[model samples]
Target chain A: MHPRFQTAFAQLADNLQSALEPILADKYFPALLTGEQVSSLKSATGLDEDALAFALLPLAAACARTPLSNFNVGAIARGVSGTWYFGANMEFIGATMQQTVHAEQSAISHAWLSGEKALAAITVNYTPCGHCRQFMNELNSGLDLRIHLPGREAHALRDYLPDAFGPKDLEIKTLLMDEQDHGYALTGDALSQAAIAAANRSHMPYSKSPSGVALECKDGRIFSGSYAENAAFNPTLPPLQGALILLNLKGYDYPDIQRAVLAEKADAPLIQWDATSATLKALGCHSIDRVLLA
Target chain B: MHPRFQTAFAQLADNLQSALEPILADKYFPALLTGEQVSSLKSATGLDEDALAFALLPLAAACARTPLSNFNVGAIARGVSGTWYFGANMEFIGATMQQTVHAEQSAISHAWLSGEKALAAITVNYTPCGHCRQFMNELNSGLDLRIHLPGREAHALRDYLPDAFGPKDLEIKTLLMDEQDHGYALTGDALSQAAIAAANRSHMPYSKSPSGVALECKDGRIFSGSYAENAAFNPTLPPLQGALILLNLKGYDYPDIQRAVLAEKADAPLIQWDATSATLKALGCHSIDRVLLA
Candidate 1:
């Protein structure tokens, strides 16, 4: 550890001590021993509450480890039945993945059976990359999980990944009303066309990729960006930067973005923007919207 | 494929064609491509002199794929003993682990076998995550490779991952390196301690989980962040936002962040970060610069 790192750690220790004083001083605070009584909390490493909390705090800050609980009842019952559950949070984990599902009833069951209280899976909903959802659907025969229904709101995993595509249209049971269209509407004036035109001017060379992306508001305000590449081959630039830049130039807010269209010339191969679901989910007009490639 | 996606593709095709025309028309471009029968180029995807020059344009434009090619000739040879190699203007490709050379000699031998006239793997100097470097080092050893000459500007794979530590150094590695020395110096500074502190001050009650993070910079700036959970437990409002905000505020340059330290209150067992190398690797850091338990 460098001297600077030491100082940072010292600060971390101080911050954590201040944060956890309440929990430790509480009377109901059970002696955190390894027993069936504390089964809801896995106590394998001989860690007490304070120790465990302290251990996890660093990850929470790094955005690596999140503390949300998602339920997948069937998977829990199967006790690690080789099923993949996706969550709104997992998109930030990285690119190497085969399949995923929303942390729904089936996944919760699996976690319960494995003696794990929560299921941590990545979802396309939080940031809604087109490719990842395609992968999930192909793998799980399109498991239909509720995206966002009002619930424990404390574990509002649903809020981030609302209305994810599932097996409902393919014979999986769905209990929603018919008038509730599964897809969201993409409605803006001619401004959408302008935004699309802007995307055509981007500088992406590796993929030989070009596209138009625009944000349209009902009041006719439009902002757009095209794919831009950096000297580094890795895709490090954010698409939202362009849109945000356009918006900032015109002075807009999150609610101002009514519809966003990304137009490209390449075949829309199964697209998956791993771990970027939150961005997409937050910038939307409706859930599950689409436009034909042609 | 979205209709919008198709439109974007057209723009990319136009840009690529325009960019490649002049380069593909060059005559003396065969120096880059080792094609025996070289002539004036016609297109971008071939080994012909013209095509090679055109392809290099995009490669240079984006700093496209540069694999670690340094190591001893023997080790590289050993690494590629059973591998089949493919040659291209910008990179080497192989089937399965055949391309995964374990030693420097094996790598060199494979390049020789591929008919490469001037090939050398430039070892990128940085501390790689343990798992990635372990696999990398194993390949180097098999190659009987001595890529770096200590202080010399050697282009060997070992040069990049300098003095890598594996399972054996668990006990003394900490003592060997000073625990507090921050590594490297970066020019731009984006994150602010005040912003991170302010974000941390926001109240989070559902799990009563508070996160504290300390980021040690090469520029001697220590940025810290805390988790601000939403009432819905969506995990969207993460402490990482502080880092991102800081990164964006400063120019969009990489941060030579030395260490990220986390601390949890005494009672929050569920909030501890994972101490596993795999976990840390996934966070994009090579090692735990230092960890403290309180």
Candidate 2:
């Protein structure tokens, strides 16, 4: 680590060690830094918001579950609310190579899941790759997003991803991280309030299908996930997948999943059904209750 | 499928059925279409190269091992030699979602492994997503690459990926599919000619690490894979991963591997060692014999 990186990490470790434990416990998940926490940390360290974001890269990288690549990468994103989120790369050892999550994905998911309205800037350990650039281009701040690398001057996302193709190119009006809500009259025995709220908060600017998923465990616990679409449609994480990631983080295995409910807009594209079904089936669940939102 | 698509499929299926069967027998691998085979098929079908490429989408999609997504996608690419290559989406059920391979990746890997000089055109059933577009931008013909969607007008890769960040932006000179042989005097007791050839043919424009992997199965068959880098960096498949893809297609499990060998440029980035080792270890191989090419 660089000397500055060492000092920042030491200070954070000394001051926020307990607060960071639960966040790092789950390799796939990240804990959000509240606005107050960010403010306090800056005041204590005498560093600005951007400086603090840059300093957090080591912690982000430390959260990486990269047994396969061993190339630990970290990212920190400052949300519109002045809150901070951390993300790290993840790799599945026995799984396919393409399944590895980039560090940028981790941070973006962290912020989105934590209800941060939009991202202001992202700091990464290494240069952002084209795939990451494309992924970032899906965000509301995409065109104007700021990126900070360790040594190089900070560059706008547009500088790295020139002439980028985004959701707007495909006529997508709603952007990821843009505040949007849908009112759907859904009533079901399997529906959970958390799932409904997640669906309402889903970022579906392109598909117009606000979707959410709730995984009901046999142990009587429920985990919810919202649909988060990417400018590159393929990287879009379906609601079920998001829920599953949370389930994994919560130390629940697939065998513990007793039931699942998917709520989606009726008029939008119904593409998630097959993928969700397939994923559930792979987890040994044969069926999922479906609710179509008006 | 459309009427014209159906007709073209039937003609190609009739002519190329025998050549495709063995390739499809291994669900994870794709077979190559030689120049002679393509010429004969074109002569028999009376369809132009572009039309035939589009028509082959269904066949390519059929090769998909998509137990996860069930969204079967297929791609066909015409190489500089006029030979055709096929690829299909692959998904690892019960694994991380990112591990799924796109149809574009499959076709490009097929062409790269088969010694096709460069890609001229690619036809897909769906619009190439931003991830695939970024992956395509890494190729030698990236700026001029032709893309054919079923109902849309043909477009260059540049049309979809405008102002793309590629190897050149990072000051890298080598491009994917640009034929270059590294004269590395590698000699070892475990070194095989197949591995040597793969290392020589690796496309490492960004990292400059000419890497290759060979899996020696207990059945006396050797599978070889060469590193193929991308402009997007993340999609750059490691040699071990490529070899494993081939191994999966060949109906051999990890337990069948008797030994593994990895050869790379000693002076270049040694980033691949950990990934290769981890993958092999997951597959029940304890160690990999490393060869540092001079």
Candidate 3:
């Protein structure tokens, strides 16, 4: 758990808090809580997994940095493995609104980065907006994915987005969580290699434009992000922003990112160089590097 | 008419072509077609308004500059005044995917920038995707807005996007096309004055953070774009991009833009400084100016 989770955990009984303390204090905050750990936590609270998860929305919201709108939204994903992952909306005060990450996106990103193959359900405090609904429509589960909101009945993603359009219309078979590796070997600088690893497994069936970014903090920690594309072009997450998302989710600020390396296909139709450079330049990232893949 | 309209209009009968040639050759291409012109065009073509409009999808799509995807989409907007406006999707080859404009957006933006108070219906070659549906949700008509697709019955925007979340969730009142002009006086340089005029008429009910951009072409022509916001934050049209939209809609390219100016509220929580500066720099725009508003 992030230090931001402390306030919410305070409400728990000592025994309940004691049960989660070990889980929360992992060297790197586990974005996911394993199925057994979630079960044990539910047992301690005498609440179902969702009830306990929903109660922690405030905790999730605490992770948001909404400098522009101040509308902090939180979301949690329940994976097929019965694990739970937390996420919150993020904003860059000086960047464009398109750069803002929705709470649902953060939660799902949390799960994907934590190695969840697919998500069964997502819990949020408010209804999903049109953008998030469309973004979620790209998932492997498609319409079958469940959405849970406070005091409302569980609904499939299809129920909210009727007469939807998707990759089927474009004849693309790969889904967001259907992982892939492009057989591109890693042979570069440390940051470049890190970005290549992310680039290799990124979700980009729409344009076949594989790309990734790695941000290095001054303190020697590194965060990697992979490009995730939506069937609708506008929601295609740039690799640089993806890396920034991981940085913030891990409780680090943008300024903490001093160096960034971007890697993408040498001849991709839609490259991320222009976007990545602009974003990094705006956020005060000092040193930037790039590598082209075969 | 945009020169791009020539190839598609080649299919028109001589009489029909004769009827529109004069209208199309006007000084600045009219983005809107008045009811009288629409009636006259229909009389010449012997096709109903929707039918004639639907047949011109290729003409509209011709206006798009999709260097990356090469998947051109077109849209036409039927304004409350019985006028029609043509629009096509736009992509900034080197910018970001978020900077890509959907066809629906271009058509509606065509109408909105032309001073249309509201849109009665929109016709497009393909179905409106989720992002466009959400973007359309912020219009004054709400669910009542009609969406017409090729060879399909017209449906309300509400039909595609069910159980939507919008401005009301954030307690916003003003909808897109319900125009407003702040009384802030135009001051400073030429671009700044144009920026102020555009800034004055921006649609920003959500954050009250109204801003606008003015781009001056090398040949002394100018285009201005006001900030248009969406209920879902990601789709908010940045002022710089909006100005750029009008530029390409009027038959200009990014490199043709040589100067830029931005004006915004001095104290708004969500200022557009960072977004404006970066976009201008990356697009070959050389000179940049800024002014504060009350």
Candidate 4:
């Protein structure tokens, strides 16, 4: 690590140890820095946001749960509010590799679930793979998002991902991290407010079927996830996958999920059913309630 | 899981146990069906090419190494020569989820590495996700390729992916599975013929940087990987990743890789270096010799 990065990382670790003590105790997730914390750190380190984001790579890398590839990767995403979200690559042993989470996904999910409206930039320890490049392309950052890689010149997301496919290609206006209100009306059963809100915020520019999933834990806690569509449809992270990541982050496993609730626009394309059911079934939780929104 | 599937699967497994006994014992890789075997299977089942392809889903799914997602996805790709290549989703525990190989990738790699010239169709047990769809779009099949999903009408690849972004957008014309000769001349320390041949056959329609990687094992066995670009830039599997997958299928792990050789077109974009290096470093193999082709 460079001297600058070492200094910034030291400050970040100190902050995590002191200001974000609760998150430190949660081994599954990385600690987040609020806008103020980030701003103060920036001033203390005399590094800009992009630099600070790069400096925080070690902290993110430390959170990686890699046991398969053993390649630990870290990412730091700066939300629109300048808050910093830390993410590390997560791998599950004895599972299909496709179910693992990219460090970018972890950071993006951290920001999205924590209620950050948009992302400005993301820095990573390694070059973003094509899959992650597509995932990042789904966000509202468009082509201008900054990608900082240590020891390399900064690049716009588009530089690394030229001729990219994204939500606009599907003619959907709303993007991930962009706010939207569907005014969805439920008919059969009343879903939780979190599920409804996640559905409203889902980035479903192509399918028009904004979907959200709420996983009710046995201990009264509810984890919610919203559909985030990518221009390359297959990379679209389903609501259930997103919710499960959140569940995992909060130190909860699949056995803790008592019931799963899915809400989707009744008239739109509901493509997540098979994947969601298959994943939940793998976790041995089969109780899923489908709530169609009008 | 269906009764019809059960019948077809039983017949296929019986054939594998007897006629294709060698493949069954291999254990690591799926069985490949020559034109004769595929034709015989089609005739025995009284099913057309597409129907027989769809019927083979169970066999393909059984090959899935999905300890993570546990959602076994199977894909059967038909080469222009009428050969059937089998692929099951492979998930690496402790690696980034994006790094996991999809079933389509397995089948595609199976065909590509086996010297299949072109792919005419692909059949899957479920809808081709955007990621797989993007991967397929990079092939010579273009928009006209057939995608058969169980219980769903056969659809053209373009039907599911509209206004898609692909290599054409970047002004590259070499479709995957299309025969190409880069006439690569190597100046490195006595490169293997297999590596040079793989480089000559590499499909780089987008970057035109036809690239190939050869992993030399301590036991003298050599495995080569060629670049397969996708219409969706993010899903393009780099030559190193392709080689790694092939290595894994042969029951060889990273420790077996003594030295790696990479050959790429000198004038083309060499964007795979960072990713390849990162992966190799994780595997603890750092001796990589680059052979640029003119």
Candidate 5:
């Protein structure tokens, strides 16, 4: 840190700490219930809000007894219930909720099929990545989703991601391929069975939240991955990639992936797979199926 | 966004836009010529230099047309690059730079081993992150690394991350383990091979730079990953977890793995990864690696 920067940073930290002091000292850990609120909070915290929020939110949430189960994964989820970490200013909180609703509706509709259960509305964090934004681009205006920021309030996800860009924007197209072209087809009958077998072994340690993902290729090969956790704080253990990698290693071309079926406990690391699904789709793959708890 | 927040955000954008308007209008861009000069620029930027000097430094650097690279990734990258939709202001710029450095130096380093190369030291807009902070923590005294800002001049990384925490604070021991207690025998071989393979495939599309990692696993698997780039923005992808995922997936278990090498690059992605790394490391396992990189 430069000397002036040192002073500036110190001043900044002090300013932020002071601003956060009141909130941290408050009871109830005041979750930004809505994306709108989250956006307001982010604005209040300024550009450094992400780091500052990461540092303070966990502690404040912990102290306030606010649950912090998916602090790491939520940011990546960017779907309904994908928690965002906005600066704890009530104002920013509101906008974040609005943006999330907009994006989620976009994504759900993108993956929609007329005969299938209309995609349920989903909530995304206010600070969704571009990948998530792309995913939301698929949804129609009717997707009704609500974003919640712990203690603050809850609102629609639409406002946060207005005019979002997604796979459609990139003009990516997915086409099914034959067995020879399918990477995982080498295992023949054993592949599909192996995926199902792998899904059974996934371990959900924290929430005992079990998640299973089954992958189907045009060549008829199947691969699966189960929920995995790390005591160390690495978000890379997510399940979507697990199945994708299995398929990839089996020689399945990136574009050859046709469908991804994901099942998880309602609150079980849903966003991790959601974001993953969107990312794959954006890259011009197929659908990601999910079983949401009623 | 709240009317108040919209007002503030718009106000902030407008303020920054005006301040940067002249700079943007200028015919040149800024670049650092030498390694040692990084410190000098830091000091010069932060100095109480006249507005004229402040206006001219960037023009001079830009006029030099040194082909300098940007340091802050994600939002900050857009902001400093004059690409942010929201305008730039002094305070906004300062805060962005400060957070960038913190993210780079504090979040990026992995003990003494697996770490990002020092690039911000010699580049323009290449700020520090968490990984750099770990190195700062390793320093016996304060005020070790140099930090440059716009007006106040150069200061030490120590001065910024003062009272900063590191790996020791979090009690990170060795590499992480799989929850299933899956065997480490074949897994170890697979992990080592994967790490090596990933390292070999390391691609630096944006920075056109590369760094290597050597992990010491309690299960005797040494995983590695090199810098990889995405076409989206050629941002530096997260480094540590790619290798760790190989280890975990292969069943090699090390609760926490210390980094083995630190390399330097001419230019690299901004320090978001570093901040995430450092912040996670400070939180303890499950705490250290849980961060999601953009």
Candidate 6:
């Protein structure tokens, strides 16, 4: 195994490490692990799915780039389809701390963008902070979502977040992962199309305003981000930041973003145009490709 | 009464109008309401303290400058000393949404900066969102803090945020409002002195890293912000942003900030220098004054 994966696997038992070795060659530190691989890891580790997920937290933590706080946190979300998505806390060295993504959000949004319909449970290396508990309340599973921490019995998200004020309180029937594609058609380049698809998948129940951002890197790669709203509005990640998370994780810096496209609904009450434009302007990308949906 | 406050008080009962007339003429949207004014208003309105706070939500909301959401939210925090501090959501027209201050935060921070020892209760027009719930958990009251929402029975913060993770989880005994000054001595102009005092007031139990920022407006006015940490790390307001919140509430635009100073512990693990510098650069204020704490 390569030295990086070899070090990440050190936290797991020898047998489990050998089992996961089959996929250790993964480039880009892909967010999702196939259901088959997960099942095999569970078998090889002689542990239940939750425990297996807990054991893999080290691998997820290794992907974190926390120049601000050297604390590394990892989370793995279990989709109803049995896929596992890796999430790690990300802190930007020269950006606002509020833009930092907690491990739970990283894992959850990763699963959402990967087309997971619903999450059954999540395993984290540490107890979830209140913001994350609030963020989790917006999911399709709602309070029934299980959260397993190290050396403890799994608890439902409701256990961590009681008396939660969430989507239902706002009379929004659709939850984050339950959002349907916004059928706004457009003819554009591949990057713009990817941006549109990401916008279509944005989870914006509160604002009813979906937004997406797509960025092109110098290595001929496209990364797109969709707005993910939380029960607590401030925890909601903007589309451009979402795209930057993907870009940063895939080893692309902000300056490497040669082109940027933003897609949003024309009739949406809250506009992302100003915030998105200012962020791009700060990063030296002064021009943006804008597409408004019907 | 001035036309501005006349419109703000329209939602309140006429009976309470003449009672609060004493403090209405104050400028700078002064955050605090004297004990005598609050007591008189309650007596005049024939409502309990909680109800009086609820009635005053409109006035608090009126101070909000929400160009983005256009949704005005106001909160009044009652301090242990029987004073009331007004807090309104502040949004920047061109800044990242994550930097936006919620109403609950505005009131809480206002009370803290104004030297309120403890918060007795808070009244709001809307249910406390999850992020606010988490943010409130860092208070001296913990979950016992009272929340009075429009048309709802007063609920303890415990009822709103159950099984929450907060400072106790990290073994940090000092809560947000309970923080003591760092006793960092400094010599400079009034702005530097103000920034030092603000840094000393910063609530940073988790990082044990107090930070402060001072901004000078062109009109020879100075506003300083102290770092306020929340149990959920992302929700913590940085010193620079906190100062901007004060500046915005007092009608100063970002460009109005002609001078800025940042003070932090020299040995702290999580430094605010880069993020603070980057934000100031984006606002077109390229220079930042720095101070190191002992």
By TM-score, the best candidate is 3
lDDT against the true structure, per candidate, is: 0.30, 0.68, 0.81, 0.68, 0.32, 0.78
> For model 5, how does the per-residue alpha-carbon lDDT over A26-132 read when each residue is reduced to its tens digit?
33332222345345545666743234333333332121111111122122112233233212110011010111111222222212200112222333333333223
lDDT of 1 by residue, B107-148 (tens): 232233233333333122221111122333332131223332
* Candidate 1 displacement at residue A13 in angstroms: 40
Where's the lowest-lDDT run of ten residues in candidate 4 chain B? B1-10
For model 1, residues A26-122, the per-residue Cα lDDT tens digits are: 4222212122422323234455433443342322222111222331111111112322221112211211111122222212222221233222332
Q: Can you write out model 4's per-residue Cα lDDT over B185-242, one digit (the tens) per residue?
A: 6555544455666778777654456778888888876788887766434476767767
Q: Once superposed on the true structure, which residue ranges of model 6 sit more than 4 Å away at CA? A: A1-8, A25-31, A151-155, A167-174, A179-197, A204-221, A244-294, B2-8, B25-31, B150-159, B168-174, B178-197, B204-221, B244-294
Model 2 clash pairs are A98-B98, A98-B99, A99-B98, A99-B99
**Against the true structure, whose lDDT is highest?**
3
Candidate 6, residues A204-266, lDDT tens digits: the string is: 766668889998887879888998876457788889877876765554567888888998877
In model 3, the runs with Cα more than 4 Å from the true position are: A1-3, A10-22, A25-28, A206-208, A254-258, A265-287, A291-294, B1-3, B12-22, B25-28, B205-208, B253-256, B265-294
Comparing to the true complex, what docking class would candidate 1 get?
Answer: incorrect
DockQ for each model:
0.01, 0.11, 0.52, 0.05, 0.01, 0.34
lDDT of 3: 0.81
Would candidate 2 be rated incorrect, acceptable, medium or high by CAPRI criteria?
incorrect
Candidate 4 Cα outliers beyond 4 Å, as residue runs:
A1-30, A43-48, A92-97, A186-193, A251-255, A265-268, A284-286, B1-114, B117-294
Better of 2 and 3 by DockQ: 3
Per-candidate clashes come to 103, 4, 0, 15, 123, 0
TM-score per candidate, chains pooled: 0.25, 0.56, 0.90, 0.50, 0.25, 0.80
C-alpha root-mean-square deviation, candidate 2: 11.5
Give the CA lDDT, 0 to 100, for residue B98 in model 5.
14
Which is the leading candidate under DockQ? 3
Tens-place lDDT digits, model 4, residues A124-241: 8876655676788788887798888888788787776654556665466767787777777544433456677778877766556678888888887788998776655446676876
Which should have the higher DockQ, number 1 or number 3? 3
- Write down the TM-score of model 2's second chain: 0.78
**Candidate 3 lDDT, A1-294, residue by residue in tens:** 667777877876677788878876753564557789888888888878778788767767877878667788889898998888878887765456787788898888778766789999999988888888888988898988999998888899988887787778777788888877877789787898999999998888766788989999978778998888887888776787667777877778777888899998876767677667766776788689898899
Per-residue C-alpha lDDT of model 2 across residues B128-162, encoded as one tens digit per residue:
76678778888888678988888889888877665
Residue-level lDDT tens digits of model 2 in A1-294: 322133435666454544444444443333457788777776666778777777677766765666544667888888888877777765443322334467787787777777777888999987766677778988888679989888778888877765565777656777887877786654766455567777988876544567788888888878788888765555766687567655643345678888888876555543455446655664577758777776
